[PDB]
Structures are given as C-alpha cells and as structure tokens.
Design a binder for this molecule. Structure first.
Ligand SMILES: Nc1ncnc2c1ncn2[C@@H]1O[C@H](COP(=O)(O)OP(=O)(O)O)[C@@H](O)[C@H]1O
Ligand SMILES: Nc1ncnc2c1ncn2[C@@H]1O[C@H](COP(=O)(O)OP(=O)(O)O)[C@@H](O)[C@H]1O
Ligand SMILES: [Mg+2]
Ligand SMILES: [Mg+2]
Lengths: 586, 586
C-alpha cells in the first residue's frame, strides 16, 4: 500500500526524460543552483554576525571598521547572490517543467482519444471546460511549490539543525525542532479545516456564476416572460450566500495566520531571550544574537505560505493521480488482437441476430437480423425510440453486441482493425459539427494527405463549390464559432464534401434532412442521390417521403424488423409502414 | 492615466457608502487596525536597536540583563501584535469588501438585463464564460492589493522617511528616496514588458486549450474520419507554442526579480556601510546599524510583490472601468417617459407600412402591412429568407421600425411600457431553452407567483403531465443541461406549458414543430389547436401542411407580402403559395 510517492515516481520520468541530454543537464544545473543559493543564504548571516562582532570587538582591522565594511558589503552581496541563484535555478528548470507537463498532457490526450464513449457517458459542458482548464495549472502549481519550496526548505532546515547543533546545540536545537513540529501540525489541521470551508465557498461561487450565465444566455426567455425582477432576486440571493461563505473562509485564514505567527514568535522570543541570557554570562557575543535572528527569519520566511503550499500540493497530487487513472483506463471498445485488415471488395452489410443494449437493465435490440446488398439503396425507418441510430452506432462498432454480430463483405467487424473498418464507412449524422478552422480544412479533414484537387472535386460533388467561390477568402474562410456562420444546409453540404473526400464504399445518412427547410431538403436530397452512384447507401430518415425511391426499405418496430420490401410492396401490404405513410400522406 | 482616477472615484461610493451606516463603522475599524499594525511594525525595530545598545554598553539604571530581556520580549510581542492587527483588519474589512463587490455586480447585471440588441453582437462561446469568471476575481485582487499593500506601504514609507531624517543624516533619506524611485521605475518598465509577454503566453494557452476541447468534443467526427494522429499532432504543436511562451514569460519574471534585488541590495549595502562608518566616528551607535537594516527590510519585503501588484491594479482598473461603461450604456429600444400600461381589450395585431432592417446597409421589411383579427388563427409562411422571424421579434419590440409601426388593440407598441407589451404576448420559438432547475421551476417560470396547481394545469393542457408523473422525482426532477436530458418534443411541451402558465391573450408559434417527430408533431399540433381556444394565435411555420387549417395565410417573399388569403383561396389563385404547396406535395 502506497500512494503520493508512487505518483511522484511515475512523474519523475517526465522530469528526468533520459531522451534529451540538454534537459538532464538543466536539471543538474538547477539542483546545483539550489545548493549555491542555500549555501549563500546560510553564509550571509555569518557575515552579519562577524560584522557586528567587529563593531563590538577589535577583530583584525586596526581601525576595526575595515572588517565591518567588508563584512556588511559581503552580507549585501550574499543577499543579492542568493536571489540571483534562485532566479537562475527558476530560469534553468522552467524549460524541463514545461516540457514534462506538456508530455504528460499529450499522453493524457492520446489516451482520451482511445476511450470511445467513456465520453458518451459524460460530455457535460461544465465537466469538459473545468477539466481542460484546470489540468495543466494544478500540476504546474504543485510541481513548482513542491520542488522549489519543500526541498529547499528541507535542505535549509537540515543545514540549520547542523549549524545550530555545532554552535550551542543543547537547547535551541530542541526548541527549533519543537517549534517546527508545532507549526507544521497546526498549519496542517487548520489548512484541512480551511480547505473544507474553501470548497463550500467555491461551490457557492460556482452556483452564483452559473445562475448569472444561465440568465444572460437565456435573455430572450427572460424578456419573453418578463422575469427580470425574479432573476435579479435569484442572483442576489446566490451572491449573498457566496459572500457569507467567503467571509467565513477569510476569517478561518486569519485564524490560521494568527496561530502561525503565535508559534513563530514564541520560538523567536525564547531563542533571542536565551541567547542574550547566555551573552550575559559571557558565553556568546551579540553577533550571535543577530545570527540567530537572521537564521530563524530565513528559515521561517518560506513557511509563511506553508498552508497554501500544502493545499496546492495536495490538490495537484490528486489531479495527477486522476490523470494517471485516466491513462490507466481499459478500452472496452475493441479487442483487435493481431487483427487482420478488413478488405471490402463487395460492400454488403449483414446484421446477424443482433441483441444489444446500453445497460443490462433495459434492452433495445431483441435479435435484429437483416441484409443490405452491395450497391443497393436501402432505407431504415421507424417510430421514435426505434433504435435505428443504435444500428448506425453499432455499424461503426462504437459498441459490441451482447449476442449477435455485424458483417461487412461477409466479415465480422469485431475481428478486424478499427482503422480498416471505419475507413470503409462514411456517415452523415443528424447533428453535424464543424471544426473551428477554414472550409478548406473542414473539407480536407476526410483524408490525411488530402490535396486541393480532391477538395475541389468534393465541393463540386456536394454542390457547394460555387458557394465557396463567392466567399472573399474562398477555401480559407474560417467558419464555425468565432468565424463565418453557415446555414444548416451549408453545414450538411460541408459534411457531405468531407465524406466525399473520405470516399468510403459504404455510406450512412442518419436523418440528414431532419431539421432543414423543404427547398434545402430537396436540394441536398438530390445531391445525396447523386453521391450514391457506385456506393452502398443506407438512408436512416424520419420522413418516409424522403426515402420512397430507395431500392428497399427496412421498417423497425420495438427494436425488431417488422417489415421489409420496396415502397410499393410495403404500401400494398397495408401494415405498419403503410399506416405511417397514410398518416403522413395528408 | 486619468481614466483610472475616474474609475477609483466612481468606486469610492461603494467602498465608502456615504448614505449607508454600519458598514462605515466597519471601515473605520479596519483603518484603525491598519494604523495600529503599522505603528507596531514601526515600533519593534526601535526595541531591537535599544536591545543591541543595551548589549553593547555596560551602563543603565536597571541590570543590563533585565533591560535586554525586556526589550527582546517587547520585540517578539511587537511582531506578534503586528501580525494580529493585520489579520484583524482583514477580518473586519472582508465584509465591506464582499458587499461592495456584490453591489457592483448586481448593478452591472441589472443594467445588462435592460439592454436588447447588444446581446446578439456578443454571443461568443469563450466571451461569456471568460468575462463572468474573470470580472469579480479581477476586482477582488485589485481592491485587496490597493487597500492593503499600497496604502500601508505609503504610510510606512512616509514614516520611515520621517524617522530616518530625525535619527540619521540627510544622506540616508536621500539615498533611500533615490533607491525607491529607481526601484519603482525599473519595476514599472519591466512589468509592462512582462505584461506584454504574459498576454502572448495567455493567448497561446487559450488557443491550445481551445484546440484540445474542440478535438475532444468532436470525438465522434474524429473517429468517423480516423484523424486521431492529426488531432494529436495539432494539440502537440499548440502545446509546444504555449510552452515556449511560458518559458519566456518566466525568464522575464526572473530578470525582473534580479533587477529588484540588485536595487534593494545596493541600497542596503550603501546604508549599512554609511551607518557603520558614522558609528566609527561616534556619530551613531551600533544599534543604529540593525535599526536601519530592520527598517529597510520591513519596508522592502512587501515591495517584492510590486510587479504583480502593479499588473493586478492595472487589470482591475481596466475591468472596473469596463463594468462602469457597461452600466453607462445607452438602451436602443427605450420606453417613452409617461408610457401608459397596455390594456388589451380586443387582441388585434396591425402592421402599418413597417420598414425595418438589422443594419442600415441591408433592408428586410419593405413596408409590410397586414391585419390579424382578434381571436383568429392566422399563419405566416414564406421561404427561408422571407424575414418572418423578424416579424416575430418586432412584435415583442426587440427592435423599432425605421419607417412604420405596429399596433396591438389599436395602440402603438412603441408608446406603451415594454413590460405590459411583452406580458400581453407569449411565444414558443423553434429552439426552446430550459433553465438549469427543476421542471416545476421551468413550467412555473411563465408567471411569478405560479403555483404547483397552475403548473399541473399547464402540463395537462400541454399533454405532458402524464410524462412528468412517470418521472421518479416528478416535478422536482432537474432537467436541462447538467441534468436529466429531455427530447426536443419534451422541451417544446415544457415551453408550451410555460406560456400557458403565462396565459397571454396573444400567442406566437415560431416554427415550434420544425424538428420534432411525426407522432409528437401531431400531438403538439393538436395541443396548439386546443390552447388557441380564446386567444389570438399566429403560427409561423415553414411546412404548409402544419398550418393548412388556419383561418388565413400570409405569404411573405423577399420581405414583402406576396399573397394573402385562406388555404383554399391561395390554392385556387395558383400563385407563389400554390407553387410552394405543389413542390412540398412530394
Ligand atoms: N446514452 C444513452 N443512455 C441510455 N439510453 C439511451 C442512450 N441513447 C439512447 N438511449 C435509448 O435507446 C433508444 C434508442 O432509440 P433511437 O436510436 O434514439 O431511435 P431513433 O433513432 O428513432 O431516435 C432510445 O429510445 C433511448 O431512450
Ligand atoms: N442578428 C442579425 N443581424 C443581421 N442580419 C440578420 C440577423 N438575424 C437574421 N439576419 C438576416 O436577416 C434575415 C432574417 O430572416 P428570418 O426572419 O430570420 O427568417 P426566418 O423567419 O425564416 O427565420 C435572414 O436571412 C438573415 O440572413
Ligand atoms: Mg437517430
Ligand atoms: Mg424564424
């Protein structure tokens, strides 16, 4: 049983790359700068003590000031050299720190892309925004505070213990040890209490800000129902709660600082009083008193932030463990063990006794079996909740069937590589998304090495090349958010051009026209009929009139195949498809 | 320059609430605690200097050991009392600070709700989240640093100048003043340079995080086209750019700290050398050396944060000026001074020669005039660019016509109060949004004092009460984002129930069923026909079959009224409406 250390040890390869010489040399130089700065900050109070002694004794300077002048100049130069070494170590190590955190983030990103519905379960705007906005900052803060506050403070504490032992290590060493122990214990307990209060304050702040954002984003609704006063009172109550929580949190912070100062000042009083008492017996000089003062101040100056340091290090460790846990996530999606590549020569589709559900307590597909001939035009229709979008998702193997299988060209898609499987399939879903880039990039996204000629051919096949030609920047016009806005038909056409760039043998149109206007619907339906020239096409449409010209139609009811056949045959059977068509006919 | 001064002058009423009591006593107590803490931190180095003097001389009315012990105990007690006074001032002032920031945020929110057009111009995704998350933070840090670091430092600097003059020579004062001036100047220049580099770093960080979020949110699309490697490389390039920018920023911070330490330690060397030189000539005592040391350290330790303080003060002033500008924003559509409340006795609608456009360079409504009789069921149809949603928006007076007007019950809507006008109108738009709360709240949002019984009646009239009854938590079920997800039909039903709770005499259905399924479409169309019992109803639909039963049909083309009449009459006319109906016949 062990954590924390384990986590830091897994992180250490990122800090210690063993692939970049320069970075290891920089880590060594940073440690050397740590040592130099600590040595200088320990040496300068000795210089101050010797200057004071020269002012109170005769020393080795005949005017006695020369030694004092030299030593006060040495004290000032030591302060400057300590700060210089600290900033030099920061400068040298910052590159290694940034590179380590960047590599960790890249690994987490690459693993996230491999997870496949670990997100479909949780894709809340708040969760995504919070995670992606916090991840790097938490680690940066934890790493910096740990490496450049705990280790330097530990080194300084050990060196101060040694020096304090050599020079009256009878009682002051015990006193400083007791003071450090009490300080750390009190800081830790009060910091845990303060972290509880801080979490409550942060929750209230998030609630108030979320209420404000929801109000401003729904301004149209507020005006529609005249709820300005109600929303104002709501936000005012939330802000009052947040203010009370913040007041209590800052009062707890004040108590923490008061206790810290009490401990520190008790140690200072004891040490200085004991030192001057020893001076009265002639044991020690006054420079020893100033020495003790400066040593204690230099020791406890980093510990002033100790509560914040502890809290931030804890949070960073938690978040780093979270990142490693995300990396150590099993991929339920595909087995693909030594899988051979899928070779689609005749693009047929087979559903063999497919039984599937999202959760074990509810069941969707009760043994659905059907055949889609290669090159045929097939439609998939059904009422709400029929599960045809689940058919679309299972064809791409977003899930694996519990009891059944899916075949492409007669080959089970569960036994082939995901790359070859998804390379043979193109899909245009109901809600098509555009990347935040130029139209040229959005169209070329279909294939990696996509050339300009292929992009032009796809824009021509999607009947959108003329629309792009009329744009001022042409293919370099940025679309999506923070860019040029496109109509729903334009988004669907860009998606069609993307899938054409991909050029897959099998195509799925999942309610492509479900939210377009009738003119645009007819235009893009003609475009889709044109694009279905030499491909196997499956059109999952809600409106039956849009797919009446299909080679065959599959009617789904309650997750099973109720009816199959051509439009005229299904109408003549006077069944479920005929009932739906009759309802929609007028 | 002077904008920050005007900003602080505008803020001062919030900090010092002239017309307000008790919080002013809190402010006075906080200032008194500031004064006590500064006095104690100035007094303790005198105790240290006198302790050193007692240790270096052999005289004194009382035993040198007694006086030395008393003075070191006084020094420790002064340190403790200074920290105690600082924490007490923080605790006392936190209430006033939180209340002032809350009142500022409330005023900004209230003024933001009283603006109509500027929302659409500023709807960027990062825009809203960034401003809402950052405004209060910026104000808080700037206020804290100003009131508790700069002003105490100014008091301490004046007191240190006075004490150095009274107890030391004109030259120590001259040197410390020149050093403070050089420190401030260097800090200012380097902090401006650092703010430039830091802004570049933040922009690159935002770009990298936005790329990561866009990749992860479009995971389905990335899998559709097998672009995992491309997305990884894009994120890696963005992260490398961000890492380089961060490295340069932290190197600039190191340079700033190096310059600050150089100035401070040059002043320290000069002052200490001058003090020991004056002591060697008998001008000053040896305790004066430690006195000067402690005074300079206590003065310049808070100035270590001067760069961050300056940057935060600048950002807070900018953001506060921006908030005050938001409060001092002119309303486009403002009420007339003595506007009477709208009295709807006969809910007719009249558009007389309405000419309107969003921008003066483009024009949408080319003098549209029409009459909607009270209690009648009217439909408004047209192509995608006809501009009928602009009719819907102008009915609610989101804008004012350029040349023309709109009447409700014979009264110009531009001459009545906005509240009564919008209270007399209810609207169900195509994309209805839910507030982040329970369904009971989402339905009761129609009216302020909406009861649970009114919610039940509205859910019954919207044919959604049974759907809510089958939910486990019933009306207390949280819906919308970060909650239970509802289908488009369910959201439209909740919106209809909301408008029913409002119970307005005039209803507008703006393409409410354009994205619903057929069974839900028929159910919600029957619901709309039912709820139109004693109300004037205007149904703006693109699909003619959904509004064929309307009393009359208004056909819009190119922003003008092309055809008017009933469904049968317009079909008989064989015009534009007949052409659209024939095209849709399918
Ligand atoms: N992420 C999910 N978690 C749980 N249940 C789901 C999820 N997605 C879909 N379902 C359920 O599975 C069913 C699948 O039907 P669906 O494919 O949506 O039909 P259609 O394609 O006609 O809308 C739906 O009724 C829905 O209730
Ligand atoms: N906020 C806006 N600023 C500028 N132009 C707009 C804005 N909103 C819409 N438009 C343009 O004005 C026209 C208004 O049409 P609209 O009434 O939205 O059509 P519909 O009634 O079919 O929704 C649209 O063609 C659109 O291009
Ligand atoms: Mg679907
Ligand atoms: Mg509209």
């Amino acid at each position: 049983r062990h954590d924390g250390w384990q986590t830091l040890k897994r992180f250490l390869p990122y800090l210690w790359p063993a692939d970049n010489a320069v970075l290891r040399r920089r880590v060594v130089g940073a440690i050397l700068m740590v040592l130099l700065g600590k040595a200088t900050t320990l040496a300068l109070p000795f210089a101050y003590k010797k200057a004071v002694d020269a002012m109170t004794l005769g020393g080795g300077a005949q005017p006695a000031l020369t030694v004092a002048l030299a030593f006060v100049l040495a004290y000032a130069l030591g302060r400057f050299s300590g700060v210089l070494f600290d900033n030099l170590r920061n400068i040298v190590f910052e590159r290694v720190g940034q590179d380590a955190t960047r590599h960790l983030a890249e690994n987490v990103f690459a693993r996230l892309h491999k997870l496949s519905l670990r997100f479909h379960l949780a894709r809340r705007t708040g969760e995504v925004t919070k995670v992606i906005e916090r991840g790097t900052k938490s680690i940066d803060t934890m790493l910096y505070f740990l490496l450049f506050n705990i280790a330097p403070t530990v080194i300084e504490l050990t060196a101060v213990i040694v020096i304090f032992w050599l020079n009256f290590g009878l009682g002051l060493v015990t006193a400083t040890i007791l003071a450090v122990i009490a300080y750390v214990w009190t800081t830790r307990t009060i910091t845990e209490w303060r972290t509880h209060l801080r979490e409550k304050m942060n929750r209230l702040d998030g609630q108030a800000l979320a209420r404000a954002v929801d109000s401003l984003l729904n301004y149209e609704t507020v005006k529609y129902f005249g709820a300005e006063s109600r929303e104002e009172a709501r936000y005012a109550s939330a802000a009052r709660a947040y203010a009370d929580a913040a007041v209590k949190s800052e009062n707890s912070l004040g108590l923490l600082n008061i206790a810290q100062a009490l401990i520190v000042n008790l140690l200072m009083a004891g040490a200085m009083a004991w030192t001057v008492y020893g001076w009265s017996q002639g044991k020690l000089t006054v420079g020893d008193l100033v020495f003790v003062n400066t040593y204690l101040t230099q020791l406890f100056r980093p510990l002033d932030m100790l509560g914040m340091v502890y809290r931030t290090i804890r949070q960073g460790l938690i978040d780093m463990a979270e990142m490693f846990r995300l990396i150590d996530t099993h991929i339920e999606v595909a087995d693909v063990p030594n899988a051979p590549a899928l070779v689609v020569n005749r693009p047929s589709v087979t559903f063999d006794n497919v039984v599937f559900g999202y959760d074990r307590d509810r069941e969707i597909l009760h043994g659905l079996s059907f055949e889609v001939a290669a090159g045929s035009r097939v439609a998939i229709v059904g009422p709400s909740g029929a599960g045809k979008s689940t058919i679309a998702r299972l064809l791409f193997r977003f899930y694996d069937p519990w009891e059944g299988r899916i075949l492409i060209d007669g080959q089970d898609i569960a036994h082939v590589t995901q790359t070859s499987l998804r390379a043979a399939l193109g899909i245009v879903p109901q809600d098509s998304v555009l990347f935040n880039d130029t139209i040229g990039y959005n169209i070329a996204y279909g294939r990696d090495g996509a050339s300009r000629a292929e992009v032009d051919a796809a824009a021509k096949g999607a009947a959108i090349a003329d629309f792009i030609a009329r744009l001022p920047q042409g293919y370099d016009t940025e679309v999506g958010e923070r860019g040029l806005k496109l109509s729903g038909g334009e988004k669907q056409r860009v998606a069609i051009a993307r899938t054409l760039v991909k050029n897959p043998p099998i195509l799925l149109f999942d309610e492509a026209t479900s939210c377009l206007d009738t003119r645009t619907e007819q235009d893009i339906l003609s475009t889709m009929r044109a694009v279905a020239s030499h491909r196997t096409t499956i059109s999952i449409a809600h409106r039956l009139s849009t797919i009446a010209d299909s080679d065959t139609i599959l009617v789904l009811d309650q997750g099973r195949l109720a009816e199959q056949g051509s439009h005229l045959d299904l109408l003549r059977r006077d069944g479920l498809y005929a009932e739906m068509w009759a309802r929609q006919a007028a």
